[PDB]
Design a protein that fits this description.
The chain has 164 residues and is an alpha/beta fold. It has a single domain, classed as Leucine Aminopeptidase, subunit E, domain 1. Helices cover 35% and strands 20% of the residues. The chain contains 6 helices and 7 strands, in the order ββαβααββαβαβα. The chain has a 4-stranded mixed β-sheet with strand order 1-2-7-6, with helices on both faces. Strands 3-5-4 form a 3-stranded mixed β-sheet, with helices on one face. Helix 5 links the parallel strand 6 and strand 7. Bound molecules: the ligand O=C(O)C[C@@H](NC(=O)c1ccc2[nH]ccc2n1)c1ccc(Br)cc1. The ligand O=C(O)C[C@@H](NC(=O)c1ccc2[nH]ccc2n1)c1ccc(Br)cc1 binds next to helix 1 and helix 2.
Length: 164
């Protein structure tokens, strides 16, 4: 049901699209959220996915944190996808703006290997402060399952394809 993606490798595909709109259209088995360790979905991809769920993602996430405590940087948890997907895989890439180790980006993408197919954003990109060209390279060199990357910014999308 994914359509219009450009094939980068055997298993990695990419499209200039809003991941919220893509999830509403496709209703994938798994949508990846660019989460923080507290599952506080304020802004970026997380704020946008949460708003699309009418804040149900944040209510579920606060119950998960109250029970389990925070995730690790490089870690993940599987929660409901609400109206966007069957499941949401909340993955914590390092936030370089907040001082986290960029080597944890490969650990973050390893979480995707537990799922056969995913709709995802580039981890640690945008407000997380990392170089998106580097994030795409770690993605293609780490993930073995089928990943459909949605890149919101048109100019970044064009740069990512032309420099790949
Ligand atoms: O373009 C990408 O997908 C990376 C992107 N991410 C966001 O910050 C980002 C933020 C909010 C969003 N809502 C749905 C999606 C989404 N994404 C980013 C945007 C612009 C620049 Br300039 C650099 C990076």
């Amino acid at each position: 049901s994914f359509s219009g993606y450009l094939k980068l490798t055997d298993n990695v595909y990419i499209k200039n699209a809003d991941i919220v709109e893509e999830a509403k259209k496709v209703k994938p088995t798994v949508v990846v959220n660019a989460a923080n360790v507290y599952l506080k979905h304020g802004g970026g991809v997380a704020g946008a996915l949460n708003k699309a769920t009418n804040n149900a993602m944040q209510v579920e996430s606060d119950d998960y944190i109250a029970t389990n405590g925070p995730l690790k940087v490089g870690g993940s948890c599987v929660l409901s996808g609400h109206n966007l997907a069957k499941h949401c895989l909340h993955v914590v890439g390092p936030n370089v703006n907040k001082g986290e180790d960029i080597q944890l980006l490969k650990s973050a993408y390893e979480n995707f290997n537990q799922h056969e197919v995913l709709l995802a954003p580039l981890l640690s990109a945008g407000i997380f402060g990392a170089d998106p060209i580097h994030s795409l390279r770690v993605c293609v060199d780490t993930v073995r399952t089928n990943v459909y990357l949605a890149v919101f910014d048109k100019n970044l999308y064009d740069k990512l394809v032309s420099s790949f």
